[PDB]
């Protein structure tokens, strides 16, 4: 049971129904691996620094969660099956290291 | 005969030859030139003067398509890059921006023995 952060960049050209379906599958997959969500920050469509999947923009989602470690990798794979999902990065949570304080 | 009137100018400069390809804003070429298009045959192509001649020749060929403004793009380190730059700069063609976009790898492939002692 460790605390992680999930960054999900998906297709910005999805309508509200397709986006709702993708987020539904994301939530269902999080429940299927026992990932208790603590907070969420939906930033949405943002301008990429380089084209990803031939698209200059991407829809960003972020989830701070807590889940068993042994299946973390096994969860990331499950999130890469959807073609609309194009970037999945899970990072162990870390305390902020402030500079120029 | 397309009457592009505005495009890009790629300069490929190596220690052996300098070759200028003038393209449209989408990258499709229109005309081009090099040290071999001019009478120079051997090592005289890797000469800044030969690069100037190639740039001016490609520019005059682009005048046939009625092009006025260009966007210069430089690739490769070779004697004659800056000479081709100054040739295109004052040739009737308006130079809007010069950009060096030399393809540098992130240490992917192994060079030939000529370029070793590095990665």
């Amino acid at each position: 049971m460790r605390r992680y952060e999930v960054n999900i960049v998906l297709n910005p050209n999805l309508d509200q129904s397709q986006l709702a379906l993708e987020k539904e599958i994301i939530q269902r997959a999080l429940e299927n691996y026992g990932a208790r969500v603590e907070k969420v920050e939906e930033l949405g469509l943002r301008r990429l620094a380089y084209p990803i999947a031939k698209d200059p923009q991407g829809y960003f989602l972020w989830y701070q969660v807590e889940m068993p470690e042994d299946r973390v990798n096994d969860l990331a794979r499950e999130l890469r099956i959807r073609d609309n999902v194009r970037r999945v990065m899970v990072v162990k949570s870390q305390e902020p290291f402030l500079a120029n304080a | 005969k397309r009457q592009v009137a505005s495009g890009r100018a790629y300069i490929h400069a190596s220690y052996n030859n300098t070759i200028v390809t003038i393209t449209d804003p989408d990258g499709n070429p229109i005309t081009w030139s090099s040290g071999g298009v001019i009478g120079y045959k051997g090592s005289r192509k890797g000469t800044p003067y030969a690069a100037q001649l190639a740039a001016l020749d490609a520019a005059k060929k682009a005048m046939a398509y009625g092009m006025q403004s260009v966007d210069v793009i430089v690739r490769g380190t070779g004697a004659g890059r800056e000479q081709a730059i100054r040739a295109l700069q004052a040739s009737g063609l308006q130079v809007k921006s010069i950009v060096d976009d030399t393809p540098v790898p992130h240490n992917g492939c192994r060079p030939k023995k000529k370029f070793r002692k590095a990665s």
């Binding site: 960054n7 290291f97 402030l98 | 010069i98």
Partner: protein, 73 residues
Amino acid sequence: PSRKAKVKATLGEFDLRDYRNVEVLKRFLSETGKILPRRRTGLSAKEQRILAKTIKRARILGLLPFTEKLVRK
């Protein structure tokens, strides 16, 4: 000698481990997508070491560039 300005001195309070804060990490990159050296950032060894990996994360996410093109040569 890089006497123009230090990126840290030209900045305030910020998190060095936040890979999502793009507007602050843009300052630590050069004109190209390259990571600025110590003489330009003015950070310490530990600070620069953390900044490097956070910048790499931001690049992989598609926020920061891997490489850019030089202009006005």
